[PDB]
Amino acid sequence: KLSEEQQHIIAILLDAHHKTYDPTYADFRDFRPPVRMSPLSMLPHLADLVSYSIQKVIGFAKMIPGFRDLTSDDQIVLLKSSAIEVIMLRSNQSFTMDDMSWDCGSQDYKYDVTDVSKAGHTLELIEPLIKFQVGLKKLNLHEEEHVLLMAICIVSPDRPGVQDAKLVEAIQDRLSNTLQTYIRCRHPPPGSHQLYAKMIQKLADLRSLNEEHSKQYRSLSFQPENSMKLTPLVLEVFGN
């Protein structure tokens, strides 16, 4: 039942991800270096990592079918509200349940709960973040489902400040129906059992994670010495 339009969408999104996610992690050497041993010693490195990721998320979003039919203002509202969530989603590709860490090809660039703690965050965020990463990894998503879920996340019509919420909803529905039909036609049981509902629950989980990250980010970035270590793009997108 996967229409030709739906096959087209999946192909575009797969290509978009391949063009915006580099699983060699070669660019990490351009970031300010990790420091692991009170001070927020990992804030410079993780700010650069996050800023880099935001650029990749914007590059992916621009390729979503229909996204560029939105106004510039609506494109900005969707990216500002979703970037944090898509970073959590896309980072699941490097996350491993072996030791609950994000392994980006190198001991320098393998991160655990202690690293994000050394950027100022607390267990109020980290504990649900890890639960989310585990629950998402356990879904064993096809790459097709992974890229559809990122795109559905970005094109959400209930983000605050959306103007043309009905066009946003129209675009998201085309993606949602593509995903629902993909699961039925290409994801064998038992892996497909309740799969779409479980993926939509992950989008709900991300809203709560967004809220707690935003709360902690506001507290951290209110201190000028912390803001000094951020990047201009992080300040624009996450807030100043």
Binding site: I58, G59, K62, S72, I76, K80, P232, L233, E236, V237
Partner: peptide, 11 residues
Amino acid sequence: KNHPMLMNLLK
């Protein structure tokens, strides 16, 4: 409340 960097990355 302007987003020149985001706006620039959106082409």
